[PDB]
């Protein structure tokens, strides 16, 4: 025994071929999932549930692997999804085909590093080219935004609900802008809560100008319907609490016991009139609520809700503009819940809910998803996540790119020109990258079901013409279509991060040349 | 393919997993189709624990017959959502799903790519929804209308006689519930069961019933005229949250501290006693107390010495129910106590059965909360009839909510058939195939009705498939002669909400299922 | 139910086992449907022994792909019978069975008791058989007709070029076989394969080929003009059946007895030698001997010294073949031997390949037995092309036997469709349903042709479903453009025997299968 006693090793071209095979398989298991013609994939989770979704990221996230490079690709997919939402419908496919053409230069005995340098030059030129072929677009103009969203979503199940989806996403994203950064305000996608409630139909789902609380009134008396409520956020518990410093009491005289019993009652009262001094209407807390304080608030005709999740508290506060408070004696009218157009408690069926709508200028909002069943609802919300993500990306960058593979073909002939002007050994890898790019439109074609070779040739030949870069591939017709009238547009940053992570995947995998197992630590 | 990635993982492929899903759905619908229809036969399930069911509501079957096929669990979830909305048609929903998928396979097996049939389904659902909206019969809240609706819902579940008995109870309840704008079906509807004397004798009680009895012998069993005190603040002992073990030096002070410790609860009970004696200066009137928490035995003695009925530890919605029954003011702080905060009942007594104890609240002046006291000879029948009761309640709730109502016995379905088939390929042509298939699948409800009722399918379907004239009526299928029937005349109906919801849910489920290709299984060991 | 009788036994029930059978048949037809059609793709099978097939003839697949479902084995048996009759359409037979059962399930699932569809199938088979009889095209034994038939059969199996090459060989064989009344396909057809030089170069040899070579060096390799001696009586040593170990006393008598023992075989060979020398007084002519049994090495020496070619241990039909080739008189007793009993060949030589040896018989004056010498680059391809050869031979045999021939490419099937659908319910009505289903199932052949050839099913079927005019022709489906085709003009045919037999067999199989309810398994441990 020398090295580690049951740690395997493998070396060289075998390792490179194995990793390339793994990457190719990873790409392959998803190649059918892309495109407006896309398939619909469903998963068997380890612990019983059912998950069905087109989105590649979730598909891969429900994959465990043994070969490592596959795990690397998995993480790559999850990163791209996190950053941009979609493109993962394409990113891993592009990376896999990139690698597949890449390996062809290994048996050329072409050492990897020079190919890597070629890839880096390729990425630089691709970024430049895409920036040259963008289109800036207004952000205020609503219907163009809706068109963008429809374009980015007409690949998953929500397509037939495109109008509702686009309106939902636009409404949600537009009204989430924390202007406190001067003119550099940032939107956030953790206040845009998504709630899945079964029953009803997709058409019933709508944007609620407020928050959803899956709780109920603590006592019968509090009114379940209020026009202009005032809201107080009590982060602290509203009841008598442990003396944190392990206090103790040693009474001697009879009255003392009943007196201390009265004292906690009195403290509860103190908190109660401290609250009511501000003339509130609504009491919210993440902690519990004493039934005695509940009594006093009832006597003041004040609605109280108990034990709500902290994130939910934050969202409510952002909804009615008030700020959370943990000290009733330190309560300030500046945190009065002004800005709640209506307080209500309905029944969805066997369960109460809390509606706080019609805020003056709500900055927080949750979306009410009402469909058929929790798994389809989860698919819907994943699609909504992707849509609202790309919408926010647009609100960060007003630059757009013609998708449908059109940009890909533009990049293709651009790199072809650079290559034929760029003599050297690295030339062949460069044009190899160019050719590898061509497969996104290809996959579009097969998922459509048309003559892939002739269609692709017509596309490429069409795109040698300088006068037009907007020629792309229609999802359903399977015919060459200029993208402008078709209107499938995408945010620039999407496709940027797409290629960028792709070539990173390429370099990271191509540098690998050996395997070692069994670390046991 | 993914096998190379992971050896222990499992996949099918497009044709294979599609066949898997259609086969599983077909098997599920075969299992369930025995249920729907009043002539249907309900099912007994036996858990591994030795328990017993005797239901027909499919949701119970799916949730309680353990299956492993994934799409089966998916359909079970959608049916559970359905039941949480309306109550029946879960059977109808699963049958629709299965047979629609059957037709879908019939067509795709002819090489039609499923997405085309998807689009056809979309257009067909649109037209069917339009027709469903236009055909719904707007009817007001006539008592007999609700009676008929309840009977139609109930005869699915039990004896004809049992449903007949229960219908009056349920309709009287619902009538005695509404505050003309919003029923909630929770507080005013108290569902309790006693293992007692019949299944028929189950009947509405105009007041509220409680699931526990007095804890002292001197507790009077019966009270002619009752004043109700609704509260939850402890009348049991309790010790402050802060460590308060105390010391003493003379044994007399030991007794003194015992008295002091009791004194706070003594004050609490004394306030109630003084309230009673102020109000019940008369001898006849009776004072009853309901506590959501417990009552101390010494407190029991105190209240008994004044002849006051008190009950402890009722479920937290029971005070809601008492509020809506006897109009009492549910309070916490006895310190702020008035006669105005009391509740009044025409009669309150105790009924002893077996070892348990029960409490009756009777003759509320204007009761707004009631109880469907379930009498059952057998434990399983209690559960079965309880599910039936909940079904009927939810059905009536939907009926009152929607000012319209749909004629029952599937006349809606033959109407959908004739309307949808009456669509020229105004669709893009290939989708007409899927539309045809969808319309064909819609006809299942009459089909399964006839099959369960014994009549021959094809000939009955053809016979009822006779829209008569310019007055081509909505024709239901007779459930005992297999003959065309005017559902509206015979008064067999169902909620518009039911049909609309089932159509939408089934369309979505089907269009999603027909779009899966492989069913993979790669999870951690 | 029988479980109480036997615990380890297994049963299904009516619906269950019926579903089992239909599912198994559907799966089998799904597996096989890739084969039929010249555009079809043949299959490679690998035995557990590591052997290899590359066939398309389904009978090979069913017999060699091990399946456990009972009805699958049943269908395999019926297909084996079919192949033992005609050669192709086993694929067609299994497809017909599967899809007919598919339609049958479509209808019975609508509650139709199967027996009704059984009767419908019976009547439909009767009418279809009548139409098939009337439509068969009576054609004489024109060489080009047989050529076209063989090409149509063969293009199912191999390269277009390979079938083109082989067609001339097979038709020339069959033409050179008939004694105008009865071919037997066994003796005159010698099927041998040499692992040599091509798959294309396989060609008919006008004479007979033998699978062994000379056993001595002085054996001349080549003979200009050959006289054939066909015999099977041993020219090897043998000892009488009765124990005959003998004794001797002088060592000289030992040699004498050795000579005596040899003397009987010496007489045998000497008779042959004398026959030769009487007949082959000329130097040029050559004498060859074929023995079904062995030849002694001393006998080898004897014959060699006269320069006589002799071969031992040929298969027992080889003398039949020599009789039909060189007209030699196969004899046993050399004692009654004449020149008239000889056989004459224009040329005989030996070809050495690998380690084995082969023998050629050439230039028979009026050969009545021949050999399809199979040249193959690869062992598996030998077997595949051999199965193809046997298919073509049997097809041509049926073609010559029946003075009629059926146009290929399923025009017969669309004709059956249009005729059967053109039957008013002259049946008892409910059977019209089964007739409809049967006619629908008949259309599979064009369907699978188009599907394998890539064209869209429904639109092609509709397009070809255009009987043109009063001259509504028998229209086949184009196998490369998916367009209506006159099979007779393009000369794509098939044997009437094939279609009639497949119709009858499939009808019987289907009507039997649809009449099973439970599949029990109770056998000894």
Experiment type: cryo-EM
Residues B322 and B375 grouped into a single domain: no
Measured distance CA(A202)–CA(C342) in Å, rounded? 96
* Tokens 């005992």 -> residue: B480
Please check if C315 is assigned to a binding site: no
In a domain, B261, yes or no: yes
Please check if A88 is assigned to a binding site: yes
Task: Read off the DSSP letter of residue C521.
Answer: B
Selection from C109, C22, C13, C19 nearest residue B448 by Cα: C109
Assess A361–B contact: CB distance below 8 Å, yes or no. no
CA-based angle C264:C267:C268, to the nearest 5? Answer: 90
Residue burial C294-314, b: 16+ Cβ < 10 Å; e: rest: ebbeebbebbbeeebbbbbbb
Please list, in sequence order, all residues whose beta carbon lies within 8 angstroms of the beta carbon of residue C295, skipping any fewer than 6 positions away: C215, C235, C236, C303, C310, C311, C312
Selection from A94, A119, A99 nearest residue A403 by Cα: A94
Find the residue in B nearest to A219 (Cα).
Answer: B320
* Tokens 């547009």 -> residue: A489
Resolution for this PDB entry, in angstroms: 4.5
Start-to-end CA distance of chain A, whole Å, equals 19
CA-CA-CA-CA torsion for C36, C41, C42, C48, nearest 10 degrees? -120
Residues of B with CB under 8 A from a CB of C: 15, 23, 30, 102, 106, 110-112, 447, 451, 456-458
Spatial strand order in the sheet of A489-491: A135-136, A399-402, A489-491
Between the CA of residue C25 and those of A429, C70, C97, C315, C513, what are the distances in Å?
53, 10, 7, 41, 10
Which chain B residues contact residue C109 at CB under 8 A?
Answer: 102
**Residue A291 phi, psi (nearest 5):** -65, -25
* Tokens 């797409």 -> residue: A498
Residues B460 and B339 grouped into a single domain: no
Please list, in sequence order, all residues whose beta carbon lies within 8 angstroms of the beta carbon of residue A129, skipping any fewer than 6 positions away: A410, A411, A414, A415
Taking each helix axis from N to C end, the angle separating C90-108 and C444-453, rounded to the nearest 10 degrees, works out to: 110
Selection from C113, C97, C92, C109 nearest residue C33 by Cα: C92
Start-to-end CA distance of chain C, whole Å, equals 20
Under an 8 A CB cutoff, do B2 and A63 touch? yes
Measured distance CA(A357)–CA(A207) in Å, rounded? 10
- Our answer to whether residue B71 is catalytic in this structure is no
Measured distance CA(C350)–CA(C358) in Å, rounded? 6
Range of the domain at B192: 140-206+368-403
Residues B99 and B58 grouped into a single domain: yes
Which chain B residues contact residue C30 at CB under 8 A?
Answer: 15
Instruction: Judge whether B443 and B408 are in contact, CB under 8 Å.
Output: no
Long-range contacts of residues A408-411, Cβ cutoff 8 Å, at least 24 apart: A408/A437, A408/A438, A408/A440, A408/A441, A409/A438, A409/A441, A409/A459, A409/A460, A409/A463, A409/A471, A409/A472, A410/A129, A410/A130, A410/A133, A410/A463, A410/A469, A411/A126, A411/A129, A411/A130, A411/A437
Which chain C residues contact residue B30 at CB under 8 A?
Answer: 15
Q: Which of B403, B422, B447 is the last residue of a domain?
A: B403
| CATH assignment of the domain containing B185 | 3.30.260.10
Please check if B43 is assigned to a binding site: no
- Chain centre distance of CA C149: 15
Instruction: Judge whether A185 and A178 are in contact, CB under 8 Å.
Output: yes
Per DSSP, the three-state class of C80 is helix
* Tokens 């209308």 -> residue: B145
Long-range contacts of residues C82-87, Cβ cutoff 8 Å, at least 24 apart: C82/C501, C82/C502, C82/C505, C83/C57, C83/C59, C85/C394, C85/C497, C85/C501, C86/C394, C86/C395, C86/C398, C86/C495, C86/C497, C86/C498, C86/C501, C87/C57, C87/C153, C87/C390, C87/C391, C87/C392, C87/C393, C87/C394, C87/C395
Which chain C residues contact residue B24 at CB under 8 A?
Answer: none
* Tokens 């190379």 -> residue: B4
Measured distance CA(B28)–CA(B34) in Å, rounded? 11
Per DSSP, the three-state class of C104 is helix
Per DSSP, the three-state class of B163 is helix
Tell me the torsion sign for CA atoms A274, A275, A278, A279: negative
In a domain, C2, yes or no: no
Which chain B residues contact residue C458 at CB under 8 A?
Answer: 110-112
Structure tokens at A87: 């493109």
* Ramachandran assignment for B293, one of left (phi > 0), alpha (psi -120 to 50 degrees), beta (any other): beta
Between the CA of residue B422 and those of B125, B281, B443, C512, what are the distances in Å?
14, 78, 15, 40
- Chain centre distance of CA A138: 23
Query: Which is catalytic among the residues C86, C91, C381, C507?
Result: C91
CA-CA-CA-CA torsion for A155, A159, A163, A169, nearest 10 degrees? -50
Under an 8 A CB cutoff, do C458 and B112 touch? yes
Find the residue in A nearest to B258 (Cα).
Answer: A254
Burial zone of C70 (CB within 10 Å; 0-12 exposed, 13-18 middle, 19+ buried): middle
Residues B266 and B335 grouped into a single domain: yes
| CATH assignment of the domain containing C47 | 1.10.560.10
Residues B269 and B284 grouped into a single domain: yes
Measured distance CA(B109)–CA(B180) in Å, rounded? 54
Residues B248 and B221 grouped into a single domain: yes
Per DSSP, the three-state class of A184 is coil
Residues B381 and B333 grouped into a single domain: no
Per DSSP, the three-state class of A77 is helix
Which chain C residues contact residue B102 at CB under 8 A?
Answer: 109
Measured distance CA(A99)–CA(A112) in Å, rounded? 12
Taking each helix axis from N to C end, the angle separating A291-299 and A254-276, rounded to the nearest 10 degrees, works out to: 50
Under an 8 A CB cutoff, do C110 and B30 touch? no
In a domain, B5, yes or no: no
Count other C-beta atoms under 10 Å from residue C522's C-beta: 12
Structure tokens at B96: 């629709």
Chain B adjacent subunits, 3+ CB pairs under 8 A: A, C
Measured distance CA(C295)–CA(C315) in Å, rounded? 15
Selection from B95, B103, B100, B97 nearest residue B35 by Cα: B95
Catalytic residues of A: 55, 88-89, 386
Q: What distance in Å separates residue C456's CA from the closest CA in chain B?
A: 7
* Ramachandran assignment for C382, one of left (phi > 0), alpha (psi -120 to 50 degrees), beta (any other): alpha
Q: Do A and B share at least 3 CB pairs under 8 Å?
A: yes
Which chain C residues contact residue B458 at CB under 8 A?
Answer: 110-112, 433
E-strand ranges in A126-181 read 135-136
CA-based angle B16:B17:B22, to the nearest 5? Answer: 100
Please list, in sequence order, all residues whose beta carbon lies within 8 angstroms of the beta carbon of residue C457, skipping any fewer than 6 positions away: B110, B111, C447, C450, C451
Measured distance CA(B101)–CA(B107) in Å, rounded? 10
**Residue B218 phi, psi (nearest 5):** -65, -15
Measured distance CA(A398)–CA(A141) in Å, rounded? 11
Please list, in sequence order, all residues whose beta carbon lies within 8 angstroms of the beta carbon of residue C35, skipping any fewer than 6 positions away: C41, C42, C43, C56, C57, C58, C61, C91
Instruction: Judge whether C257 and C245 are in contact, CB under 8 Å.
Output: no
Which chain B residues contact residue C106 at CB under 8 A?
Answer: 106
Please check if B525 is assigned to a binding site: no
Which chain B residues contact residue A67 at CB under 8 A?
Answer: 5
Between the CA of residue A303 and those of A107, A221, A275, A280, A282, what are the distances in Å?
75, 8, 12, 9, 5
* Tokens 């374009």 -> residue: A151
**A with B: how many residue pairs have Cβ under 8 Å apart?**
185
Q: Which of C14, C24, C108, C111 to mutate to test the interface with B (most CBs of B within 10 A)?
A: C111
A367, containing H or E segment:
strand A365-370
Measured distance CA(A238)–CA(B239) in Å, rounded? 19
Between the CA of residue A362 and those of A183, A208, A313, A346, C183, what are the distances in Å?
19, 10, 15, 21, 96
Residues B362 and B215 grouped into a single domain: yes
Count other C-beta atoms under 10 Å from residue C275's C-beta: 19
In a domain, C202, yes or no: yes
Measured distance CA(A323)–CA(B332) in Å, rounded? 30
Task: Read off the DSSP letter of residue A178.
Answer: B
CA-CA-CA-CA torsion for A48, A49, A54, A60, nearest 10 degrees? -40
Write down how long chain A is. 521
Under an 8 A CB cutoff, do A25 and B5 touch? yes
Please list, in sequence order, all residues whose beta carbon lies within 8 angstroms of the beta carbon of residue B371, skipping any fewer than 6 positions away: B189, B190, B191, B192, B204, B205, B207, B208, B209
Find the residue in A nearest to B74 (Cα).
Answer: A50
Measured distance CA(C194)–CA(C197) in Å, rounded? 9
Residues C356 and C216 grouped into a single domain: yes
Measured distance CA(C157)–CA(C38) in Å, rounded? 7
In a domain, B1, yes or no: no
Structure tokens at C350: 């030996």
* Tokens 């379930």 -> residue: B374
Q: Which of B95, B110, B459 to mutate to test the interface with C (most CBs of C within 10 A)?
A: B110
Nearest by CB to B111, from C30, C109, C456: name it: C456
E-strand ranges in C209-284 read 209-210, 222-223, 226-231
- Chain centre distance of CA B23: 31
Q: Which of C367, C395, C421 is the last residue of a domain?
A: C367
Count other C-beta atoms under 10 Å from residue B133's C-beta: 11
Start-to-end CA distance of chain B, whole Å, equals 20
Structure tokens at A59: 């598909």
Residues C252 and C362 grouped into a single domain: yes
Measured distance CA(A84)–CA(A396) in Å, rounded? 12
Under an 8 A CB cutoff, do B111 and C458 touch? yes
Burial zone of C446 (CB within 10 Å; 0-12 exposed, 13-18 middle, 19+ buried): buried
Measured distance CA(B4)–CA(C366) in Å, rounded? 63
Chain A adjacent subunits, 3+ CB pairs under 8 A: B
In a domain, C6, yes or no: no
Selection from B120, B69, B121, B149 nearest residue B391 by Cα: B149
Q: Looking at chain A from residue 87 to 146, which residues have their Cβ under 8 Å from any Cβ of chain B?
A: none
Write down how long chain C is. 525
Count other C-beta atoms under 10 Å from residue B7's C-beta: 8
Please check if C157 is assigned to a binding site: yes
Selection from B378, B401, B521 nearest residue B51 by Cα: B378
Measured distance CA(C349)–CA(B149) in Å, rounded? 100
Burial zone of C89 (CB within 10 Å; 0-12 exposed, 13-18 middle, 19+ buried): buried
Instruction: Judge whether A124 and A499 are in contact, CB under 8 Å.
Output: no
* Tokens 């002007």 -> residue: A421
Selection from A286, A303, A301 nearest residue A231 by Cα: A303
CA-based angle B399:B405:B407, to the nearest 5? Answer: 130
- Our answer to whether residue B383 is catalytic in this structure is no
CA-based angle C289:C291:C292, to the nearest 5? Answer: 155
The domain total for chain B is 3
Q: Which of B342, B367, B392 is the last residue of a domain?
A: B367
Return the percent helix, strand and coil in chain C, to nearest 5.
Answer: 45, 15, 40
Measured distance CA(A115)–CA(A109) in Å, rounded? 11
Find the residue in A nearest to B83 (Cα).
Answer: A199
Helices assigned H by DSSP within C312-378? 318-326
Measured distance CA(C462)–CA(C472) in Å, rounded? 15
In a domain, B25, yes or no: yes
Selection from A509, A429, A506 nearest residue A15 by Cα: A509
Nearest by CB to B78, from A22, A221, A373: name it: A373
E-strand ranges in B306-380 read 309-312, 343-345, 347-352, 357-362, 370-375
Measured distance CA(C178)–CA(C165) in Å, rounded? 22
Measured distance CA(A228)–CA(A238) in Å, rounded? 24
CA-based angle A378:A383:A388, to the nearest 5? Answer: 120
Measured distance CA(C235)–CA(C303) in Å, rounded? 11
In a domain, B480, yes or no: yes
Between the CA of residue A275 and those of A284, A288, A336, what are the distances in Å?
12, 16, 11
Instruction: Judge whether B361 and B187 are in contact, CB under 8 Å.
Output: no
Please list, in sequence order, all residues whose beta carbon lies within 8 angstroms of the beta carbon of residue C109, skipping any fewer than 6 positions away: B102
Between the CA of residue B415 and those of B421, B499, C65, what are the distances in Å?
10, 13, 51
Instruction: Judge whether A345 and A216 are in contact, CB under 8 Å.
Output: yes
Under an 8 A CB cutoff, do B260 and A257 touch? yes
Assess A244–B contact: CB distance below 8 Å, yes or no. no
Q: Do C and B share at least 3 CB pairs under 8 Å?
A: yes
Measured distance CA(B79)–CA(B92) in Å, rounded? 10
Between the CA of residue A474 and those of A93, A411, A477, what are the distances in Å?
19, 19, 6
Instruction: Judge whether C53 and C463 are in contact, CB under 8 Å.
Output: no
CA-CA-CA-CA torsion for B509, B512, B514, B519, nearest 10 degrees? -110
Selection from C69, C75, C89, C90 nearest residue C23 by Cα: C69
Assess B258–A contact: CB distance below 8 Å, yes or no. no
Structure tokens at C302: 């004897």
Under an 8 A CB cutoff, do B458 and C106 touch? no
E-strand ranges in C272-346 read 286-291, 309-312, 343-345
**Residue B152 phi, psi (nearest 5):** -60, -45
Structure tokens at A263: 């004292």
B267, containing H or E segment:
helix B251-279
Per DSSP, the three-state class of B189 is strand
Measured distance CA(A516)–CA(A3) in Å, rounded? 11
Please list, in sequence order, all residues whose beta carbon lies within 8 angstroms of the beta carbon of residue B473, skipping any fewer than 6 positions away: B411, B467, B486
Between the CA of residue B340 and those of B227, B309, B328, B331, C103, what are the distances in Å?
11, 19, 8, 12, 77
Nearest by CB to C110, from B23, B30, B457: name it: B457
Please list, in sequence order, all residues whose beta carbon lies within 8 angstroms of the beta carbon of residue B48, skipping any fewer than 6 positions away: none
- Report CA Rg, chain B: 30
Count other C-beta atoms under 10 Å from residue C6's C-beta: 13
Residues B152 and B38 grouped into a single domain: no
Selection from A155, A117, A94 nearest residue A500 by Cα: A94
Residues C79 and C176 grouped into a single domain: no
């Amino acid at each position: 025994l020398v090295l580690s006693q049951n740690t395997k090793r493998e070396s060289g071209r075998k390792v490179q071929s194995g990793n390339i095979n793994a990457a190719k398989t990873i790409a392959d298991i998803i190649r059918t999932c892309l495109g407006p013609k896309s398939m619909m994939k469903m998963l068997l989770d380890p612990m019983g549930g059912i998950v069905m979704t087109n989105d590649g990221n979730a598909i891969l996230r429900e994959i465990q692997v043994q070969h490592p490079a596959a795990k690397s690709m998995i993480e790559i997919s999850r990163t791209q999804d996190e950053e941009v939402g979609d493109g993962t419908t394409s990113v891993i496919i592009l990376a896999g085909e990139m690698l597949s053409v890449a390996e062809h230069f290994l048996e050329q005995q072409m050492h990897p590093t020079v190919v890597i340098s070629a890839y880096r030059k390729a990425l630089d030129d691709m970024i430049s080219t895409l920036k040259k072929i963008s289109i800036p677009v207004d952000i205020s103009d609503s219907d163009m935004m809706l068109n963008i969203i429809n374009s980015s979503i007409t690949t998953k199940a929500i397509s037939r609900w495109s109008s509702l989806a686009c309106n939902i996403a636009l409404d949600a994203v537009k009204m989430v802008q924390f202007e406190e950064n001067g003119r550099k305000e940032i939107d956030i996608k953790k206040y845009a809560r998504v709630e899945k409630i079964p029953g009803g139909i997709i058409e019933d789902s709508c944007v609620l100008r407020g928050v959803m609380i899956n709780k109920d009134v603590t006592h019968p008396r509090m009114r379940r319907y209020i026009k202009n409520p005032r809201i107080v956020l009590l982060d602290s518990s509203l009841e008598y609490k442990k003396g944190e410093s392990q206090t103790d009491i040693e009474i001697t005289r009879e009255e003392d016991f009943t007196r201390i019993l009265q004292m906690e009652e009195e403290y509860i009262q103190q908190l109660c009139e401290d609250i009511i001094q501000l003339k509130p209407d609504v009491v919210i807390t993440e902690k519990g609520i004493s039934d005695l304080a509940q009594h006093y608030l009832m006597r003041a005709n004040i609605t109280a809700i108990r034990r709500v999740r902290k994130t939910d508290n934050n969202r409510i506060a952002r909804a009615c503009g008030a700020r959370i408070v943990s000290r009733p004696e330190e309560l300030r009218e500046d945190d009065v819940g002004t800005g709640a157009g209506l307080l209500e408690i309905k029944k969805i069926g066997d369960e109460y809910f809390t509606f706080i709508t019609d805020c003056k200028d709500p900055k927080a909002c949750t979306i009410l998803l009402r469909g058929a069943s929790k798994e389809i609802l989860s698919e819907v919300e994943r699609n909504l996540q992707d849509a609202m993500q790309v919408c926010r990306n647009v609100l960060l960058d007003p630059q757009l790119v013609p998708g449908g593979g059109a940009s890909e073909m533009a990049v293709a002939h651009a790199l072809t020109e650079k290559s034929k002007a760029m003599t050297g050994v690295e030339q062949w890898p460069y044009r190899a990258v160019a050719q590898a790019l061509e497969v996104i439109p290809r996959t579009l074609i097969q998922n459509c079901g048309a003559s892939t070779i002739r269609l692709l040739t017509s596309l490429r030949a069409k795109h040698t013409q300088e006068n037009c870069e907007t020629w792309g591939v229609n999802g359903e017709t399977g015919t060459l279509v200029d993208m402008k009238e078709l209107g499938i547009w995408e945010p620039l940053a999407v496709k940027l991060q797409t290629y960028k992570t792709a070539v990173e995947t390429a370099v990271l995998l191509l540098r690998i040349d050996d395997i070692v197992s069994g670390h046991k630590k | 393919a993914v096998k190379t990635l992971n050896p222990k993982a499992e996949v099918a492929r497009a044709q294979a997993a599609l066949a898997v899903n259609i086969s599983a759905a077909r098997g599920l619908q075969d299992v369930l189709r025995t249920n729907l229809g009043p002539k249907g036969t309900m099912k007994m399930l036996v858990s591994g624990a030795g328990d017993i069911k005797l239901t027909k509501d499919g949701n119970v079957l799916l949730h309680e017959m353990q299956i492993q096929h994934p799409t089966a669990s998916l359909i079970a979830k959608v049916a559970t959502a359905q039941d949480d909305i309306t109550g029946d048609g879960t059977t109808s929903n699963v049958l629709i799903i299965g047979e629609l998928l059957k037709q879908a396979d019939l067509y795709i097996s002819e090489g039609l790519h499923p997405r085309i049939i998807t689009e056809g389904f979309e257009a067909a659902k649109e037209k069917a929804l339009q027709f469903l909206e236009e055909v719904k019969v707007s009817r007001e809240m006539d008592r007999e209308t609700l009676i008929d609706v309840a009977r139609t819902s109930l005869r699915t579940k039990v004896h004809a006689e049992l449903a007949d008995v229960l219908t009056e109870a349920v309709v009287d309840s619902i009538l005695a519930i509404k505050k003309q704008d919003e029923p909630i079906d929770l507080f005013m509807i108290e569902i309790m069961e006693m293992k007692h004397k019949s299944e028929t004798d189950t009947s509405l009680i105009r007041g509220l019933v409680l699931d526990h009895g007095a804890r002292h012998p001197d507790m009077k069993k019966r009270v002619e005229d009752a004043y109700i005190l609704t509260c939850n603040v402890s009348l049991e002992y309790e010790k402050t949250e802060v460590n308060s073990g105390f010391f003493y030096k003379s044994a007399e002070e030991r007794e003194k501290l015992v008295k002091a410790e009791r004194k706070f609860i003594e004050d609490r009970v004394k306030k109630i006693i003084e309230l009673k004696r102020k109000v019940c200066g008369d001898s006849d009137k009776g004072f009853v107390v309901i506590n959501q928490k417990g009552i101390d035995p010494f407190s029991l003695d105190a209240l008994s010495k004044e002849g006051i009925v008190a009950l402890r530890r009722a479920k937290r919605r029971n005070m809601e129910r008492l509020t809506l029954a006897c109009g009492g003011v549910a309070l916490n702080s006895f310190d702020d106590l008035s006669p105005d905060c009391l509740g009044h009942a025409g009669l309150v007594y105790e009924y002893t059965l077996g070892e348990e104890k029960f409490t009756f609240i009777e003759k509320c002046n204007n009761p707004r909360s009631v109880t469907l006291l379930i009498k059952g000879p057998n434990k399983h029948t209690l559960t079965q009839i309880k599910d039936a009761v909940r079904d009927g309640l939810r059905a009536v709730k939907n009926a009152i909510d929607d000012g319209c109502v749909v004629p029952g016995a599937g006349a809606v379905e033959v109407a959908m058939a004739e309307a949808l088939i009456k669509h020229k390929p105004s669709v893009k042509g290939r989708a007409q195939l899927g539309v045809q298939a969808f319309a064909d699948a819609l006809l299942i409800i009459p089909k399964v009705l006839a099959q369960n009722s014994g009549f021959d399918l094809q000939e009955t379907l053809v016979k009822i498939q006779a829209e008569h004239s310019e007055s081509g009526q909505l024709v239901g299928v007779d459930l005992n002669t297999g003959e065309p029937m005017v559902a509206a005349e015979v008064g067999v109906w169902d909620n518009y909400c039911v049909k609309k919801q089932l159509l939408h849910s089934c369309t979505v489920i089907a269009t999603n299922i027909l779009l899966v290709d492989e069913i993979m299984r790669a999870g951690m060991s």
